[PDB]
Structures are given as structure tokens and as C-alpha cells.
């Protein structure tokens, strides 16, 4: 299908279907296809894919924690080249946040 | 591959530490200077192999509060995650 990689688009897809849209691949998957972060070759080895799906450890504790809740993150607005600073953050109980300033600040969007 | 050095005796805040890291690891200009920003840089930006030499660790803990240990921990987890990171603590 066509790539879905905008805040609303992914946000709505995660709530509705409880999974990321099909254009996302984890860091490990990307690495097994030949991704080399420093080269910025993700679209060469995985055309139309974006990094998304890995566990988000919420290291600064800015997102709300709960026993049982784990978070995950995925890149937003990415097409090719070096990665940007936009991410979408989503929890096991479907809370959805974003960040556009490389995890300095977060806004609750669902 | 890439070599980074932290002269811990020159670290006077957690801002210094993050800004030293931004230069030494060739991080993005948008680098968020936070623990989440560093993990993401370590696992989706940084060129490897990576050798981090952190000198005067104890002194760098004085004005970074809990920051020196937190940052260190992020590199160790990154290394536990498979990243090719060598850490040298002096």
C-alpha cells in the first residue's frame, strides 16, 4: 500500500488496527537488510520503509508510566537519507504522543 | 572507526556533557541533549566502530548531578543491544 508516515496517519492506524502501517521496519530488521545509520542508506536497502517499532525506554521519564505499560517509537516524516527529529510514541494500552524536537518535549495526540 | 574523548575535568554541567558528546560523536544539529536523544543517536545515527574514552569520570560526576552515570548507562545498554562500542573509563 501507499506509505503512511504522518502523525495523524500513523496515530489513527495504531489506534484502529493496533499495529503500525506496513512501511515500518525495526532497527534490527533494517540492519539485516544492510542499513548503515551513518551512511543514511535506509531507502536504498529498504525502499519506502521507515525505522519504527522498537521499544521506547522513556529514559527521561517524560511519558506517563504505569505498571504493565511499555512504549514503542517510530519515525515520522521520513523519506530518505539521514533520519530526522520527528517521532511518534505509542504505549501498550494505546496512548499516543509525538515529539518534533528530538525527544526534548512531547505532545499527547491520542 | 570513530573515536570520542571526554575530558571529565572540563565537564561543568550536563549541558557541557551533551554538547561534548554532540561534537565527539558527530551528532545531528537537532540533537536533543537528553537521554532519549542519545539512545536514538547511538542506535540510529552514530558511525561504528566507536571507541569512547571517558577520562576523569569521577570529576565529571560532580557538576552533572546524576547525569554522568545516566549517560554512561545509555552507552552500556547500546553496547548490550549489539552496538559496537568500546568504553574506556579513566
From Swiss-Prot, chain A:
Belongs to the ribonuclease N1/T1 family. The chain holds residues 48 to 157 of 157 of the full protein. Its EC number is 3.1.27.-. It is found in: Secreted. Introduced by genetic manipulation and expressed in male sterile maize and rape by Plant Genetic Systems and in radicchio rosso by Bejo Zaden. Barnase expressed in transgenic plants will specifically destroy the tissue(s) where it is expressed. After cell transformation, protein expression and plant regeneration, the active nuclease destroys the pollen producing organs thus rendering the plant sterile. The lineage of its organism: Bacteria, Bacillati, Bacillota, Bacilli, Bacillales. It is an enzyme of class 3 (hydrolase). The active site is at 73 (proton acceptor), 102 (proton donor). The keyword Nuclease applies. It comes from the Bacteria. Hydrolyzes phosphodiester bonds in RNA, poly- and oligoribonucleotides resulting in 3'-nucleoside monophosphates via 2',3'-cyclophosphate intermediates. Coiled coil: none annotated. Keywords: Endonuclease, Genetically modified food, Hydrolase, Nuclease, Secreted, Signal. GO terms for molecular function: RNA binding; RNA endonuclease activity. GO terms for cellular component: extracellular region. This is Ribonuclease.
From Swiss-Prot, chain B:
It is found in: Cytoplasm. Keywords: Cytoplasm. InterPro entries: Barstar, Barstar-like_sf. GO terms for cellular component: cytoplasm. Gene3D superfamilies: Barstar-like. This is Barstar. Belongs to the barstar family. The keyword Nucleotide-binding does not apply. It comes from Bacillus amyloliquefaciens. Inhibitor of the ribonuclease barnase. Forms a one-to-one non-covalent complex. It comes from the Bacteria. Pfam families: Barstar. SUPFAM superfamilies: Barstar-related (SSF52038). CDD domains: Barstar.
